[PDB]
Amino acid sequence: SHMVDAFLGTWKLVDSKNFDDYMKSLGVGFATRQVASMTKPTTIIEKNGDILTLKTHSTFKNTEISFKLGVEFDETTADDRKVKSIVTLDGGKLVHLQKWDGQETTLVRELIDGKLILTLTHGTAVCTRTYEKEA
């Protein structure tokens, strides 16, 4: 859509809250958390007609997903969960839902003041990750 166009580009992490707690909630062990916490990853968001691609680049792990809005797709996460995923658009918010093993976690991205804010939720664990556009 025209709402999606605003997310397009290269984004760099400049701040983080509760990410270690989030990973813990998912079951990521201390050793891996220490490593993933330390990194300051870059996320590339691109569009190719109907297909959105989302790339994360970092020393900890590189991941890439492509998908169409509203169409369920399989995903292997950075922490190696095999999940059923679906990305929707609620107004300004790009809402990513992952299901697996009777569990659910949401990854919401919205634009606020030219910054991309990613909110990762799993149960009581709520993580806020702030990105600045590189352009």
Alpha carbon distance 69, 88 (integer Å): 5
Place of tokens 């990613």: 118
**DSSP-based three-state secondary structure for 47:** strand
Interface residues for ligand 5M8 in 68-127 (CB under 6 A)? Answer: 77-79, 107
Stretch that binds ligand 5M8, among 22-30, 67-75, 84-92, 109-117 (CB under 6 A): 22-30
> Does 33 show up as a binding residue in the annotation?
no
39 is an interface residue for ligand 5M8 by CB under 6 A: yes
CB nearer to ligand 5M8: give 58 or 130.
Answer: 58
CB nearer to ligand 5M8: give 48 or 124.
Answer: 124
Closest CB 128 distance from ligand 5M8, rounded Å: 12
Per DSSP, 103 falls in state E
- Class of residue 30 by CB neighbours under 10 A (exposed 0-12, middle 13-18, buried 19+): exposed
